[PDB]
Amino acid sequence: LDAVRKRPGMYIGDTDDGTGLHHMVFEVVDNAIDEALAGHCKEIIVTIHADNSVSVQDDGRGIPTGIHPEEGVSAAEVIMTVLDNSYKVSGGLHGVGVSVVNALSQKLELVIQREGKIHRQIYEHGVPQAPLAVTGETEKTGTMVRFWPSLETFTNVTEFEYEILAKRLRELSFLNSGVSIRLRDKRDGKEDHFHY
Amino acid sequence: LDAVRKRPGMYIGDTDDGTGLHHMVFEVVDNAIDEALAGHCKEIIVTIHADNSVSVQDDGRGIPTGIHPEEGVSAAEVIMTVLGVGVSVVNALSQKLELVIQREGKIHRQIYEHGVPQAPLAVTGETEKTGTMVRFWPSLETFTNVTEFEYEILAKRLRELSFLNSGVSIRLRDKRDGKEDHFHYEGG
Numbered sequence A: 001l002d003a004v005r006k007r008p009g010m011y012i013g014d015t016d017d018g019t020g021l022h023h024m025v026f027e028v029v030d031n032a033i034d035e036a037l038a039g040h041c042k043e044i045i046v047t048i049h050a051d052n053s054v055s056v057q058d059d060g061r062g063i064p065t066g067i068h069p070e071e072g073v074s075a076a077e078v079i080m081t082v083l084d085n086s087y088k089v090s091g092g093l094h095g096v097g098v099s100v101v102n103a104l105s106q107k108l109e110l111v112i113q114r115e116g117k118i119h120r121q122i123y124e125h126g127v128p129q130a131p132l133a134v135t136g137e138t139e140k141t142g143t144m145v146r147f148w149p150s151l152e153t154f155t156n157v158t159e160f161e162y163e164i165l166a167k168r169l170r171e172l173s174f175l176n177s178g179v180s181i182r183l184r185d186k187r188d189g190k191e192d193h194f195h196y
Numbered sequence B: 001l002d003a004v005r006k007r008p009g010m011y012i013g014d015t016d017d018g019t020g021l022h023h024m025v026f027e028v029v030d031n032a033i034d035e036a037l038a039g040h041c042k043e044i045i046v047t048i049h050a051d052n053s054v055s056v057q058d059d060g061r062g063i064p065t066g067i068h069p070e071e072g073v074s075a076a077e078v079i080m081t082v083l084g085v086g087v088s089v090v091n092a093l094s095q096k097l098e099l100v101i102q103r104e105g106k107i108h109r110q111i112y113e114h115g116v117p118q119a120p121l122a123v124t125g126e127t128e129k130t131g132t133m134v135r136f137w138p139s140l141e142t143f144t145n146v147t148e149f150e151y152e153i154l155a156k157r158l159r160e161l162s163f164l165n166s167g168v169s170i171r172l173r174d175k176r177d178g179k180e181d182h183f184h185y186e187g188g
């Protein structure tokens, strides 16, 4: 992750004009759309929270929680902490992903519902605060990622603009025909529902 | 550095009682003494600043500044960002670190924040002297409860060190209250 932290603009996009800030959301949405393509709804919920964080919920299978043989930690943690064909229909870039988002977030909350169990983990600037842990039981399945962008990295344009997210999620709904995409803004109660 | 950030206590020691905090200073001092042994003057200056940072100056040859062929960055940056515990551990657990290297007629400068370099090592001027200066601000996210440096803990340790390192001048300076010491044993 130190290569990303050193030159964040090279991975996520321009960190001053708002390109990078919003691409953080689109990388998390990318992961969610790939996961959503295997569900009992195929729906994602993108929420802009009042504290200037964004959460993305999907109803997919859930990120694998078992221990990775080589790394010796949960497979979820490996995904969060290890880094013309680059384009993806889900909207992210190959060679970026959620590990870059995690590295450039002052906080990231991961919640996985899988195999009848709720798993939780917290990161700060890409560093796990404890191992992925079973915190309860559940009937549902899915992955939730909520991230607080690092205000050290992202300057000038620090607040999430609704219209920039809404525009991109509309484009993605046409490319991802089966998937439902809900956008919610808790600052002013604004909302949209994109489905092809 | 991610391994150090995940479990800081395993490398630097206890981050709550103050022992880890002062070990950050002593790790840098061990490196500075080492560097000092290479020039003839052999002098290091340890300063406790008013903004709760510690700087350590030496008059050695300077950390190598040329490009590392594998990493493609200055050898100094490789030293500061790759895993005594090593200076890279001190860098990782410092919310800010300033590096100033005097070498081959040139002043080189670089700033880090939590181990991450903010720009490449840059030649900013000229000098007739040689040496390395590391000034670090301990990360308040890691070091809790006991956050401030204690003069007596440093003063005592630097005195013990002076007797094991003959010819090395060790100056201690406290900018908070103007207190200073000079440990310089010339035996053997």
Ligand SMILES: O=C1C[C@H](c2ccc(O)cc2)Oc2cc(O)cc(O)c21
Binding pocket: B028, B029, B031, B032, B035, B056, B058, B062, B063, B064, B079, B087, B132, B133, B134
């Ligand atoms: O590993 C280090 C750290 C050390 C250093 C660290 C802090 C400080 O205040 C002074 C020097 O300088 C070096 C100088 C070298 O030629 C080779 C090295 O591998 C090192």
Ligand SMILES: Nc1nc2ccccc2[nH]1
Binding pocket: A005, A124, A125, A127, A152, B005, B113, B114, B116, B141
């Ligand atoms: N505030 C802050 N910024 C950080 C960057 C990398 C690792 C830890 C960090 N804490």
